[PDB]
Amino acid sequence: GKLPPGPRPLPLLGNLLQMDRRGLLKSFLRFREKYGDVFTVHLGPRPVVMLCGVEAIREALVDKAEAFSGRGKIAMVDPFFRGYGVIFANGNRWKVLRRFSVTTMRDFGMGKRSVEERIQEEAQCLIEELRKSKGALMDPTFLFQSITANIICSIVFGKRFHYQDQEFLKMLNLFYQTFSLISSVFGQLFELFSGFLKHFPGAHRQVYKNLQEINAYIGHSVEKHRETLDPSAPRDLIDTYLLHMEKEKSNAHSEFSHQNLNLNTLSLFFAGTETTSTTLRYGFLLMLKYPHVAERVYREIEQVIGPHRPPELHDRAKMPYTEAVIYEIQRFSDLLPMGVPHIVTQHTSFRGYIIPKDTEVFLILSTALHDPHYFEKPDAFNPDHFLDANGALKKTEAFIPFSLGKRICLGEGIARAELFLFFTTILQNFSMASPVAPEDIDLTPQECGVGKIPPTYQIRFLPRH
């Protein structure tokens, strides 16, 4: 008959004095102990409903999709995106951009490469680079970002960038820094007190600046595309958008605007790059800490694929152990622990509570990924979490790192293909080493907010043979 129960708030501060210094997620997990799976937290001036566990999350996103499919704000990036692009759009804008993005992220036209082939080619470029790396120590972040960025680039720009391109690397650095700043303790505080903190210097201003710098490239690329556009033969996603723009130009309210073009494109690149690369970063740190897992994956690669033939998506069904390892990397790395904020679009009943229209909702994906009923000892890295007694792949409904329902990650298929192909192609060709003994490796995230970000680390890729 009212909102879900929760800690008693104070005017101005909301529930600040009841929060945990370790961050938002820890805070909400402490509230879950007391209130259960459905509760309200006042983040500064705003009530936010938290939903925990796969049952509550699925009930909201799947069974009640007519109410829970709205997109909420991330305070650190809202001043930039301002509801433009598919991630941060609502209503008809979202309908149009989602439909457009889904179609263009999968259909490239006659005589164009499949997603699979794009990844396989990028994987071969990566192996070549790693061979030329001379077994040197590196932080692999730049390469994990390059390979994933290049998949999106091939779709959006119709090209890839070279690993040596300093201007490409500058953009990748901006994505990396931005994701870290957003996920920082300041970024989390801003979620509570943006109304006040927006008047002062801080990370929010650096985030704005970083994003506009990336956007500057996108805008210029759009103009280059427009100058060379052949309506009979669109080259890429940008061309296809420009054609819709032309078609709808007599409509002043067309969603196919330049602001949607720039910011949808930026949205796709940001999500397409930072998600998969961060997962890869964690994945290889985990392989350094658990070398027996990496050794067992390599044995499976040897037995199924061999040393020379490039891995392909068809190999997945015959590689239950490798698939389990990747599932477990995703489960353990818990990329977006609180997902991306939703908003309720209409007055709704949920488990006896009344949630008014326009009430922000966080689906705490982390609580599903760490559910001890689905994953025994969920705090530990263990590929057996995704294997049955016979060593066959055991998929589970608790595995929801891409979320669920209408807003489900539109890049899920691309991401899974990237994870499998890049992971297997690297391990086929290289073993890993570092100066830190497995027992000494610390998996504690460098940042844990909107994103869970692994610590920096050094690694060697040693050619096999």
Ligand code: HEM
């Ligand atoms: C390991 C990799 C990835 C993970 C864990 C992940 C996870 C997520 C999550 C949790 C959401 C929020 C869904 C919600 O609102 O409930 C999301 C949304 C989104 N993702 Fe991903 N994602 C990944 C890779 C990608 C890739 C490679 C792309 C680009 C092709 C992408 C594009 C998007 C877009 C455009 C949205 C916004 C969807 C919408 O609001 O309609 N993601 N993703």
Ligand SMILES: OC[C@H]1O[C@H](O[C@H]2[C@H](O)[C@@H](O)[C@H](OCCCCCC3CCCCC3)O[C@@H]2CO)[C@H](O)[C@@H](O)[C@@H]1O
């Ligand atoms: O349009 C005006 C602006 O242009 C010049 O900046 C350039 C630099 O000339 C130029 O070197 C540069 O090259 C970037 C190529 C790499 C693109 C990487 C993409 C990866 C995926 C997401 C989009 C970016 O891109 C920037 C934006 O075009 C300038 O740096 C800024 O003065 C100026 O604000």
Ligand SMILES: OC[C@H]1O[C@](O)(CO)[C@@H](O)[C@@H]1O
């Ligand atoms: O819609 C597909 C989604 O549904 C699930 O299978 C539920 O477990 C998720 O793993 C997947 O992301």
Ligand SMILES: CC1=CC[C@@H]2C[C@H]1C2(C)C
């Ligand atoms: C979908 C997303 C993945 C990571 C961060 C939040 C969005 C982003 C702002 C691109």
